[PDB]
Design a protein around this ligand. Structure first.
Ligand SMILES: *Cc1c(COP(=O)(O)O)cnc(C)c1O
Ligand SMILES: *Cc1c(COP(=O)(O)O)cnc(C)c1O
Ligand SMILES: [Mg+2]
Ligand SMILES: [Mg+2]
Ligand SMILES: [Mg+2]
Ligand SMILES: [Mg+2]
Lengths: 318, 318
């Protein structure tokens, strides 16, 4: 019996993917089963509650972040529960579904209209966040790419739950990246108990997080157009890049073999573990996380016509 | 640690709605936090597993049901996990989102095209189900309106969990209806422990389940165009009808006061409990269920333009 929905954040299920990985012990943490629908419930709850506890955030404090995705939805839920104003800075590319969910939770949306000269809205949204911090008195910037509380939420969140459940040695921990909060915080907790666990980052082809050559990327959730301040690269032992097509095939294989309907970055994870398995020992124990549901990828991954277009994008292999 | 996603069906959270109901003890069972996204995980899992256990369903058995909604999605998930073929009979009114989710799980869809003479597809889908049962050898009809396993799943499911958690006397149990499996099965279990609990059905205005005058109804999930065989009316102590507008206001109030983003029939439940509270004792203990998420109601309940249209439909009150 809970007093709030907040009490059901965390303690997410762990499954073994027996059918998909018959020659390894692969455990998936179902972070998408958080009450808000994604893993971002963890940093949204943790960051806001920490700020309230330490007097940085009061009922009068206006929360700000540039996000069009899962973190915007999570922040909107937590802000509504706590009685806090929230403004999400977004751009015209936001999916109508996410926009409507964020607005349904009563958050404000500040949509930038001016692309930079070469078509992106990235620098425009960075600037808009600073404008709001200049003009809205009593504000708190979630600051997802630099806030230590992001990775700390994952250290105390799924990272702690993983090492309590998977007490046998963890040979590989595999996570997708955007802010790198998840892989930093979870790997830090895992390696306290399993110091020899290898930490494998999965990124989108074209993401600049690990210096890849930028290409047009369709899938949200995985990859970034900046190097996050949160990232400490010496803590990453292997980096696997996956393209949109590969990722989508991974999602479709996971639902076919296991009946788990997960989002794009989970497909990236599946593709990456299939690559990893060609080099590692049979029987290895691999832990990963499934951040969100397939539901908002119906016109991406789960669309056959989109899939065919992504197949055509594989450069020379197309 | 689970071997399958199926192990995470059930044991859903119970919250208290302190803010929405400050003068009563109102407990909500979050059935939408089942892994498939709605309460229909319970009958889908229970019915299929029972059939397999008793030799009515084997790997060669083709599952059939007429459903465009939550039960189709749940059946598709369970069928995929179990390795079973599924055909959902639907009509042109199916939402594109639900259609895409059911197809993503690998289920077959049989969409009827011929309305009857007065515009509905109800009799056409009833006939299509019998045609498939005539022409597909080795089939099993889920038969949601008449299958005893539907209400049994809820007796063993949330009903059992409710009486284990809420050991204090339950004064009112409030549930929405379509097949009446939920209210029948859950009330039967509740009244073993709390024989004086009053059982309150919440239906859509215009639904024929309790003999209301049919009107055009927008919201899916609640109400039916037949009297379910499953229903035993002597077990229902009070019936509250709610219209589309009322239900939508209930959803919007629940998310505003509690940060819970739930679907149409949850709004019906909220509207009905607000009515109930005008007659019952202050401080009463009320238990209810929240069957699904707000996510597929973004162009219904959570659309301001749709809400205004429903406001205009309230007959003389408009
Ligand atoms: C947040 C997110 C990630 C990446 O997590 P970070 O902690 O930001 O590195 C991957 N997939 C999805 C769907 C996400 O929401
Ligand atoms: C199934 C369903 C109901 C009604 O439940 P029954 O057991 O069929 O009476 C109400 N709301 C939603 C969203 C449902 O999926
Ligand atoms: Mg002010
Ligand atoms: Mg970026
Ligand atoms: Mg045959
Ligand atoms: Mg009907």
């Amino acid at each position: 019996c809970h007093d709030s929905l907040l009490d059901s954040v965390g303690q997410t299920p762990m499954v073994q993917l027996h059918q998909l990985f018959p020659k390894h012990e692969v455990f998936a943490k179902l972070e998408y089963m958080n009450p808000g629908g994604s893993m971002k419930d963890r940093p949204a709850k943790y960051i806001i509650e920490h700020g309230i506890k330490h007097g940085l955030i009061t009922e009068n404090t206006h929360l700000i972040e540039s996000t069009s995705g899962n973190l915007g939805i999570a922040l909107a839920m937590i802000a509504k529960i706590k009685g806090l104003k929230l403004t999400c800075v977004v751009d015209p590319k936001i999916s109508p579904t996410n926009l409507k969910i964020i607005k349904s939770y009563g958050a404000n949306v500040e949509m930038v209209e001016e692309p930079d000269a070469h078509g992106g809205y990235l620098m425009t949204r960075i600037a808009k966040v600073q404008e709001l911090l200049a003009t809205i008195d009593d504000a708190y910037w979630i600051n997802q790419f630099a806030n230590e509380l992001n990775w700390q939420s994952h250290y105390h969140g799924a990272g702690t739950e993983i090492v309590e459940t998977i007490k046998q040695p963890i040979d590989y921990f595999v996570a997708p990246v955007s802010t790198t909060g998840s892989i930093m915080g979870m790997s830090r907790k895992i390696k306290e108990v399993h110091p020899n666990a290898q930490i494998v980052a999965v990124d989108a082809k074209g993401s600049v997080i690990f210096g890849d050559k930028p290409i047009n990327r369709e899938l949200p959730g995985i990859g970034a157009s900046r190097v996050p301040e949160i990232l400490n690269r010496s803590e990453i032992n292997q980096v696997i890049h996956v393209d949109d097509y590969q990722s989508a095939l991974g999602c479709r294989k996971l639902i076919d073999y296991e009946g788990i309907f997960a989002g794009g970055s989970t497909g990236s994870i599946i593709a990456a573990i299939e690559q990893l398995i060609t080099s590692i020992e049979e029987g290895a124990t691999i832990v990963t996380i499934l951040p969100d549901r397939g539901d908002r990828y119906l016109d991406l991954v789960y669309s056959d016509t989109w899939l065919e277009k992504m197949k055509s994008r594989q450069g020379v292999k197309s």
